[PDB]
Amino acid sequence: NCAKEGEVCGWGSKCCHGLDCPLAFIPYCEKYR
């Protein structure tokens, strides 16, 4: 559902909404820049 900056997305989370989670082998939720 949601993840905190430094969390693994695409396999564990997908960014709550304030984080950017790209679709890759090992993507991580990070603030949009």
Curated annotation (Swiss-Prot):
Subunit structure: Interacts with TRPV1 (2 toxins (4 moieties) bind 1 channel (homotetramer)).
Annotated disulfide bonds: 2-16, 9-21, 15-29
UniProt similarity note: Belongs to the neurotoxin 23 family. Double-knot toxin subfamily.
Site positions for Interacts with TRPV1 (reaches into the void formed by S4, S6 and pore-helix): 11, 25
Site (Important residue for activation of TRPV1): 23
Protein name: Tau-theraphotoxin-Hs1a
Subcellular location(s) of the protein: Secreted
Swiss-Prot/TrEMBL Domain repeat ranges: 1-29
Transmembrane portions of the chain: none
Function: Selectively activates the heat-activated TRPV1 channel. It binds to TRPV1 in an open state-dependent manner, trapping it there to produce irreversible currents. It binds to the outer edge of the external pore of TRPV1 in a counterclockwise configuration, using a limited protein-protein interface and inserting hydrophobic residues into the bilayer. It also partitions naturally into membranes, with the two lobes exhibiting opposing energetics for membrane partitioning (K1) and channel activation (K2).
Protein species of origin: Cyriopagopus schmidti
